[PDB]
Ligand binder design. Sequence first.
Ligand SMILES: *[C@@H]1O[C@H](CO)[C@@H](O[C@@H]2O[C@H](CO)[C@@H](O[C@@H]3O[C@H](CO)[C@@H](O)[C@H](O)[C@@H]3O)[C@H](O)[C@H]2NC(C)=O)[C@H](O)[C@H]1NC(C)=O
Ligand SMILES: *[C@@H]1O[C@H](CO)[C@@H](O[C@@H]2O[C@H](CO)[C@@H](O[C@@H]3O[C@H](CO)[C@@H](O)[C@H](O)[C@@H]3O)[C@H](O)[C@H]2NC(C)=O)[C@H](O)[C@H]1NC(C)=O
Ligand SMILES: CC(C)C[C@H](CP(=O)(O)[C@@H](N)CCc1ccccc1)C(=O)N[C@@H](Cc1c[nH]c2ccccc12)C(N)=O
Ligand SMILES: *[C@@H]1O[C@H](CO)[C@@H](O)[C@H](O)[C@H]1NC(C)=O
Ligand SMILES: [Zn+2]
Length: 861
Amino acid sequence: PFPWNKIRLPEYVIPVHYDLLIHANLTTLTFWGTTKVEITASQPTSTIILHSHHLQISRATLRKGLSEEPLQVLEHPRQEQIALLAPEPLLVGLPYTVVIHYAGNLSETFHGFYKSTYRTKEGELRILASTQFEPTAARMAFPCFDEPAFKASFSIKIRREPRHLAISNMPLVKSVTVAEGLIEDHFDVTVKMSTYLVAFIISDFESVSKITKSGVKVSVYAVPDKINQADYALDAAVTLLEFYEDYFSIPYPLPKQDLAAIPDFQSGAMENWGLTTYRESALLFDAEKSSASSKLGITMTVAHELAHQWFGNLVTMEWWNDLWLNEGFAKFMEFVSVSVTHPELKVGDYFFGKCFDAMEVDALNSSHPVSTPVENPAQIREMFDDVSYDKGACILNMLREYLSADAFKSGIVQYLQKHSYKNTKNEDLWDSMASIGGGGVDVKTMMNTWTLQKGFPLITITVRGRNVHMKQEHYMKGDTGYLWHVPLTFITSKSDMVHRFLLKTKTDVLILPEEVEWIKFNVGMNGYYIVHYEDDGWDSLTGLLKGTHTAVSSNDRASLINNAFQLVSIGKLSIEKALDLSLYLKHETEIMPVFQGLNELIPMYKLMEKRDMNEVETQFKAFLIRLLRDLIDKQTWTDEGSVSERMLRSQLLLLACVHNYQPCVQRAEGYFRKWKESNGNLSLPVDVTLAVFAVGAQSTEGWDFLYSKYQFSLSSTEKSQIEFALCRTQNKEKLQWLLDESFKGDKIKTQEFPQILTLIGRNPVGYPLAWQFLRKNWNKLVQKFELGSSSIAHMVMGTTNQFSTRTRLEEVKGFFSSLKENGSQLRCVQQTIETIEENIGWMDKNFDKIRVWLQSEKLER
Ligand SMILES: *[C@@H]1O[C@H](CO)[C@@H](O[C@@H]2O[C@H](CO)[C@@H](O[C@@H]3O[C@H](CO)[C@@H](O)[C@H](O)[C@@H]3O)[C@H](O)[C@H]2NC(C)=O)[C@H](O)[C@H]1NC(C)=O
Ligand SMILES: *[C@@H]1O[C@H](CO)[C@@H](O[C@@H]2O[C@H](CO)[C@@H](O[C@@H]3O[C@H](CO)[C@@H](O)[C@H](O)[C@@H]3O)[C@H](O)[C@H]2NC(C)=O)[C@H](O)[C@H]1NC(C)=O
Ligand SMILES: CC(C)C[C@H](CP(=O)(O)[C@@H](N)CCc1ccccc1)C(=O)N[C@@H](Cc1c[nH]c2ccccc12)C(N)=O
Ligand SMILES: *[C@@H]1O[C@H](CO)[C@@H](O)[C@H](O)[C@H]1NC(C)=O
Ligand SMILES: [Zn+2]
């Protein structure tokens, strides 16, 4: 009979200091550990409950202070807990020391204390051991009070062979030759931090280091053959760390900051205090082969983790229900920091795709509020979704633009200083914001309306001369009674000046000083809502876009497109009028509106490919190509221009070459011929590399040649482009081979499996293979990627969310229901089901309409 029955830990036993000794054996893939945890008790008890998972406990003692007493061990695998029973009840106010000896073996997965391998340039395979403890994986490496609220200090000691190199959260204090033939590294003691931030790495990495203007030792570790790609990472890391220190007015508390490129990683990165971990693709930059997209991604990722150093590490959420207080703030500090440190990137151009893609799912009935209760690890992993990142950052952007940027900065500085080295709830942020908003600004109620209910509002705007009527309702892809405090912003045809109005009720009205030709709400996509215009409003905006699209901003044009199509999804606008608005892209030239038009148009022919709709689908693809043909023709085949122009060129050339624009196809075939005859030695323009590989991979010869180069390539961008090209094939046998080998993890590492599966589910001849593979290997995939993880969500959605028929809907429902306790309760499952339902509705309503509209559009030249 186990003396505990709740998933949460007892509140009356608090740890204060962990002392960890880990001996990891790379040859036998084992490790023995000793954990000494100093605790205090507030209620007299003889039972100590803590976390432990897949760890063999062999010995347990309890020291008082002199006196040491044995503890009896009880195990609960369902709750991932152990209970330690003490002969004499603990005395309140006294410090005790629990000492546990345990053993286990490096996880073969992507979490806990797991193994990674890398290939040398001589073909040899080398092994290292890394950590990934967020959210509840520290218990797989050391028994502890594995919750973010039980903060404590950590004194770490790691045992290794001499041939190895050990790094952790703190600097290395000393090395002692314990026993014979293996060294023991004693690291400095950490600060008050949560348990999920513990990390340690045993490898043979090389490193590059640099000093900040504040004296912190910033270093970047990687495998020996890839250390020469860490320069941009290190430089941007120093710049962003100095920026964050200066901005928050709070120095970095640790002596050193490390950025390690792990060969086997699940997430993009991890914010381990003093030892951030990354994907090699997400940290390393090769000037010869990496793309401008890759450079921007590295910059944004480094900014994200260095922001986590404050939002998450210094001030941590108390429970995983408010994980957005970490993740949304970090995703927003990405923008706030990079837009200052690397202004040549101009991240304000590409930020709001996050808000749009987040609305795509938050408009669903299965969506959840930004802050929602969770208990078990599957739910906690599910919390790392588009809401907590994208929607959190978008509502934070809206709040910072409603308040002054100066007021937002003062609020966040007060927040971090008041709650440093502690935990916060959702309400502490609103308290810190209301301590600054004193012009009649109740931040609390507004942000409660934005964080405590799901979805986002639709604002309908009616104009009767000089009167502007505004009505808010809950946008829901088919009546609840939700209400927001929407800080509306708008401009008129008579003024580029931004006028504001705070809509706190269902309907309201303001008075213009003069009649206007058009009015545009949600200026610059700084608000997390969508806008509909009554009467001839959409016609007026269509005329504006087709006449002088430069009358409004790039973000405004993108928001117009996205809002038009999302309103088609609920009937406030016809699909025909939406496409009439889309026709303006024939003269569009900016990256954000073009990319938004593509992101809103591609899913339609993606839905059509899954059905018998060849004529209408071909008409649609031809129309899409003819829409951008002028811009595609004007695009050059070089690496010229800014980062924005380079990414635009790459995507345009890839799109044209995929949809069979014969000039693009001919030139890409020529480049691929010259390259293949050069044996990969010819340097191709990184921007056109995607299109060249995608064209060359259509034939079996070029496909096999590309794969032959894949094994030995060392550029992560080159690897990703090769993956995309190989997934673009029509050979079912090769698709099956890619799937199986990326699953096995030998020829293609498993970290790339979810993206490869998603691309193959996009493939018009591969989607049954992807769906069937996910179904038939669900068990091992779940064991590898954890339940409810963003990887599982990505796989499920990439394999199913393009289905459009009731037969497919029943397939999905039946399979995920028969899964029972192994994934039937997945929020991603519910979201895919609702997405398929909305796809069915949208297809039954708009497909034949689109066919008629395409015939009408061909009858236009
Ligand atoms: C992980 O486990 C492996 C295997 O149990 C350990 O390898 C063994 O390590 C010991 C001590 O280093 C070796 O003994 C010594 O080998 C050297 C080799 O020149 C010899 O000169 C010494 O007199 C002594 O025999 C042992 O040979 C070696 N076994 C083999 C064949 O690899 C490894 O050390 C463990 N790593 C740690 C520190 O956890
Ligand atoms: C990873 O480490 C664990 C230990 O933490 C290894 O567990 C060991 O597994 C073997 C094989 O199952 C166990 O032997 C078994 O004994 C049970 C009855 O006690 C018997 O029913 C089984 O048929 C088998 O003979 C062994 O007991 C267990 N560890 C301990 C200390 O009991 C595990 O094998 C390691 N990883 C892998 C992949 O093996
Ligand atoms: C690029 C940048 C924003 C870094 C960031 C890493 P972190 O700093 O948000 C880390 N703390 C995630 C921790 C984690 C790991 C595994 C399961 C759940 C939670 C990221 O990759 N975001 C992606 C991908 C992602 C987040 N959680 C994941 C969990 C599994 C797989 C992928 C992900 C996103 N926008 O979600
Ligand atoms: C949304 O989904 C839930 C199931 O969790 C269902 O009970 C509810 O009825 C759905 N929406 C509506 C229209 O009520
Ligand atoms: Zn994060």
